[PDB]
Design a binder for this molecule. Structure first.
Ligand SMILES: *C[C@H]1C(=O)[C@]23[C@H](O)[C@H]1CC[C@H]2[C@@]12CO[C@]3(O)[C@@H](O)[C@@H]1C(C)(C)CC[C@@H]2O
Ligand SMILES: C[C@H]1C(=O)[C@]23[C@H](O)[C@H]1CC[C@H]2[C@@]12CO[C@]3(O)[C@@H](O)[C@@H]1C(C)(C)CC[C@@H]2O
Lengths: 124, 124
C-alpha cells in the first residue's frame, strides 16, 4: 500500500522499509456515528498489536474512528485530525478522497505517509 | 526520484505533490575540505532561490556541503546531520549509499523524503 521506513542497524542508522497493510473500519462525526465501514485505515503489524496512522474516506466532517483491540477483546475510538483533501484515480472514475491522520501521530510519520502516497498512488 | 507533498488550498487543506529536483554538490569532513562534487542534493524551486533538503552520497564522514549563491555574490556551506545508511540494488551489486539531512530540516520533510524514497527506490 504505502511503504514507511525505520532506522535499524547497529548504530540505529540503517534504513529498513516497512509496507503498511490496510483494512476497513468505521468512522463518524461522533462515537455513535461510527456504525458502518465508511473508511480505509493504514496500519502497521507490530508486536503490541495493530497501530493506526491515518484514515482514507469519502466524507469530510468525520471526527472519530472505531477499531477492535488486539484479538478484538474490546473497542477503541481515536480522534482524527482535520482532513487532507486530494484526488486519486480510482479505477472507476476519478474520485475525491480525504486523508485523516490519527491525532497524536508524529510529523515524521505524517511525512513518510504522504511522500509514500505522493510516490505510489496517483494524486491530482 | 523523490516527490514531496504540500498543503495548499483555499484553507490549506489541499494535498499538492511536488517533484524534488537534484544536482551535484561538493561535501567533506569540514568546510574547507569541500572541493570536488562528491554527492547529490535534492532541492525545491521556490521563487527567489533553491532549498536543499538532503544529500545522497557514497561517502560517510560528510559533515558539510557547499552551495553557490546563484547570484555570484559567493557560496553557502550547510551543516549535515549524521548520515542514514541504506542499501539499494544496482545490477553491479548491492550499492551502499549514505543519506544526509540538512541540520534543521523539520521532521515532516524528513518523512516525505524517506517515504518518497522507500517506494520509488528498491530498498532491501
Ligand atoms: C539516519 C539518520 C537520521 O535520519 C537521524 C540521524 O541523523 C540518523 C539516525 C537517527 C535519526 C534521528 C535523529 O537525526 C536524524 O537525521 C533524524 O531524522 C531522526 C529524528 C526524526 C530527529 C528523530 C529520531 C532519530 O533520533
Ligand atoms: C491536511 C491536514 C494536516 O495534515 C494538518 C491538518 O490537520 C490538516 C491541515 C494542515 C495540517 C497542519 C496542521 O495539522 C496537520 O495534521 C499537520 O500535518 C500540519 C502540520 C505539519 C502540523 C503543519 C501544517 C498544518 O498546520
Amino acid at each position: 500500500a504505502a511503504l514507511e521506513v525505520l532506522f535499524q542497524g547497529p548504530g540505529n542508522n540503517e534504513l529498513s522499509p516497512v509496507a503498511l497493510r490496510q483494512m476497513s473500519c468505521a468512522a463518524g462525526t461522533t462515537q455513535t456515528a461510527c456504525t458502518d465501514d465508511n473508511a480505509l485505515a493504514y496500519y502497521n503489524t507490530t508486536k503490541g498489536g495493530r497501530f493506526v496512522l491515518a484514515l482514507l474516506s469519502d466524507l469530510q466532517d468525520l471526527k472519530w474512528a472505531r477499531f477492535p483491540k488486539s484479538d478484538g477483546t474490546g473497542t477503541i475510538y481515536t480522534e482524527l485530525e482535520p482532513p487532507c483533501r486530494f484526488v486519486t484515480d480510482t479505477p472507476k472514475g476519478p474520485k475525491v478522497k480525504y486523508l485523516y491522520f490519527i491525532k497524536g501521530l508524529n510529523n515524521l510519520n505524517r511525512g513518510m505517509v504522504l511522500g509514500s502516497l505522493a510516490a505510489t498512488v496517483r494524486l491530482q
